[PDB]
Amino acid sequence: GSSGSSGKSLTLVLHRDSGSLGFNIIGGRPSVDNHDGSSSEGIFVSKIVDSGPAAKEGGLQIHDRIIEVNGRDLSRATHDQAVEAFKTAKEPIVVQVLRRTSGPSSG
Numbered sequence: 728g729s730s731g732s733s734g735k736s737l738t739l740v741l742h743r744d745s746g747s748l749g750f751n752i753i754g755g756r757p758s759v760d761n762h763d764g765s766s767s768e769g770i771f772v773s774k775i776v777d778s779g780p781a782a783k784e785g786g787l788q789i790h791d792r793i794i795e796v797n798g799r800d801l802s803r804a805t806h807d808q809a810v811e812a813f814k815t816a817k818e819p820i821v822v823q824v825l826r827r828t829s830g831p832s833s834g
Contacts, residue, residue, distance in 0.1 A: 734825045736794060739786030741813070741820040748813050748820075749779015750787055755805025770801045770809040772824075791824040 741748055751774035770793045775782045793801050793809065797816040801809045813820070 734827055735829070736823055736825055737786075739822045739824060741785045741787065741796075741816075741822050742780040742818045743816075743820075744780045747776065747779060749776040749781030749783070749785060750774060752793065752806055752809045752813075755807060755809065767803055768805050770804055770806070785822075787822070788824065788826065791826065794823040794825055796820060796822045 750772055753771050753773040755768045755770065772787055772789055772791045772793070775785075775787055775789050777783075779785070781787045795801065796809070796812045797820045799812045799816070801812050804812065
């Protein structure tokens with residue numbers, strides 16, 4: 728068989744309190760430099776509104792890489808897309824993040 732590789736994937740349901748998922752994302756730079764070094768973009772959480780439905784029931788976690796949102800892949804998407812995704816996203820919004828092992832270091 729073949730299923731998995733590293734890290735773990737969790738699901739989180741996000742909602743919209745009012746044009747505010749209740750958090751912020753980072754990544755996606757408007758620079759398409761020739762392929763050589765750092766390439767591809769990523770969507771991560773740098774902020775999270777407590778009072779927001781993202782921190783409330785959302786389940787999100789500051790410094791978390793979004794894998795999918797409402798079924799929309801944003802792993803290689805940009806803030807623009809991510810934003811739009813979460814914007815055009817409907818509740819409940821099924822989001823997935825990639826979190827390392829449950830217990831990092833220290834057996």
